[model samples]
Target: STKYPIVLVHGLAGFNEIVGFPYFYGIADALRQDGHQVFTASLSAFNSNEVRGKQLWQFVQTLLQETQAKKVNFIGHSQGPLACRYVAANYPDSVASVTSINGVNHGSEIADLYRRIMRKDSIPEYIVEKVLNAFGTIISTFSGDAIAALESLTTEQVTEFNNKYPQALPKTPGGEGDEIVNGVHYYCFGSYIQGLNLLDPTHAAMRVLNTFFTEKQNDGLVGRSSMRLGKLIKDDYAQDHIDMVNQVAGLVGYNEDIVAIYTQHAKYLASKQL
Candidate 1:
């Protein structure tokens, strides 16, 4: 086991588990089976990163009290990593390391595209906000600003976010950033492929969304360059955005086993005694 426990954070419209289906699939139990203590964080399904980050901070404090651990490692996915980054930047002592799995550190072109198409107070914007906020409430039992969540993921907004919390962010676009900030280590990995599984319904959706990305090398939602954080850890997986978490009933790509990847990372953390 590592020196500290591990906390797994979910992305937008995600939960620790919904109706017995986990957001990160079978990852938490797999880590526990390997003797690592793990906890899954549950935040509002739709909200600003700052709001979600504050929620994570409270969860981490309670976790510290329960486990008596000084710090915990964070493994976040999609929008989840942004929340972890917020916590790491603000409360560094509480976090030992941050491992981003397909994190949106530099925002996504998809969000930018949506923002461009949906003008402020437009009909499309209103409809999307209403639908997503309702779905968010259904998922997390909390009503959050879906429009705020979408706006926060735009490249323009993330630039401002980076200015406010520039912890493990890349200095230049598509470049590597500081590996350590305030004694906290940072690591990242992501995928560049879409439509990896034909059987999964989300695969087609990823294929459609991949067309909107100017970067081209994106995993449906986030580009490979945008997913980079501190230490690079294989940014070209054959998985899509949802596949990274082994979703759609665990129908993932054949190139890699998602569970094993997490287990190996846990061992790596233990090797460093983090």
Candidate 2:
């Protein structure tokens, strides 16, 4: 029998296959074409990891039953990792590993800023909640529902999240015999593509990111430190945030083709029997 089938989870504002939108872009296609079973499943575009995690758990069950597999490897991007992490933590037997690419494991400064502005303006909690709830409703119409995904992203909210779902994967690179979260391999990756490395679409956001956190290194939306969740595989890539998923239209990586990198990762998993 083959190794664990791969499950590809999308991040914020992501869909399994959206019209005129490419979330995971060519990553999923590349994985499947390479003789590996990959599923780029979609969750709420904007919602807390808990809600999304519940949804993912259902999908995981379906996939396991359909394929008759014991466990599946989870590969998530952006908010996707957190959702996968939830299942891995609560349903460890169902997961072989969880890999994060530029994930918001830690709270985002951008999310924190929005909360700060709302508080500074003295925005009423009821009003904010109502607005977000309404927005979540609207989002569910097209994508998935979002609630905690937005509320729990801010620094203040994530601070609470740390205590609620504290997960510190073993720093050890080898997956076998881990102290915490055994039988679940946790891997994280980040990018610092600012200045010369940043490209067009993501490059546009750099000006905005620089206005707030100047000294910090980021891939436009997420900081480098926040991306560090478990055993970091590759932390420094010249590609920007979207570039990590190969979503920047026609523009390719200046130094490396990201699609190739992901294809290689699939092979790495096979080699390790992970």
Candidate 3:
């Protein structure tokens, strides 16, 4: 439907598909139904953005060659946007646009809380690192450093990272960033609700995690202000982080149709001739 192929990239502890269940749920199928060629990228389940970025760049190059498309539009979720940002910045010519869904453009308070609790060489830190690293390996089939991934998501470290790859980032806090950079259009959106569905366990977990955030306006893991990247879409959706992607067998809330949002966004991209 668009001028370029659309690629769906997943976030931390994510997978392209596991036993027929996709990370983005019904998103890719919805895009394909609207006549758009879609692909899901697979990267490390847990790792630093720099490492995952390199993996994404390689995947994009291969996808370009296979699809014979000059450029691709990336729809990334959470930390997935960071990987897409890396590719768009490094290989601008190969990217048509980047849409971030509940992206952690700014650091997350949850990561900060994790860092605070997991002290250096402590027993709890060791247990968490070991367990998460194994879990990442199981999901991605690739070994990665979970601690490194956690560190990268922290506020302090993300501040340092922004300095190195300052592309579509806002110059000031809670402000819109550059919509177009290096011929690539950027857009972002997120939600503020955590408890959306009582039947969904992730929603219950998010309800507990919501307490960690100083700002009440957060999508479980990411703050409302931290979701902006370039062109601001709608940040006040009545969905949580997991609901943004329609995860956990698509047991999402009733306020918004998650599939429809993605389908409409695809149409918007087609209208823009991207």
TM-score of each: 0.87, 0.80, 0.87
Residues 109-208, candidate 2: write the lDDT tens digits.
6566556545566756754554444344334433533333556666665556555655653333222123236577777777876454334444444435
lDDT of each: 0.80, 0.68, 0.79
Task: Select the stronger candidate by lDDT from 1 and 2.
Answer: 1
Give the top-scoring candidate (lDDT): 1
Model 2 alpha-carbon drift over 4 Å, by segment = 12-19, 120-149, 169-180, 197-199, 250-255
RMSD of each: 4.6, 6.1, 4.6
Clashing pairs for predicted structure model 2, backbone only = 46-146, 47-149, 48-148, 48-149
Where does model 1 exceed 4 Å of error? 12-19, 120-148, 194-196
What TM-score quantifies how close candidate 3 is to the native fold? 0.87
Model 3 Cα RMSD, Å? Answer: 4.6
Better of 1 and 3 by lDDT: 1
> What order do candidates take by lDDT, descending?
1, 3, 2
How close to the true structure is residue 98 of candidate 3, measured as C-alpha lDDT? 90
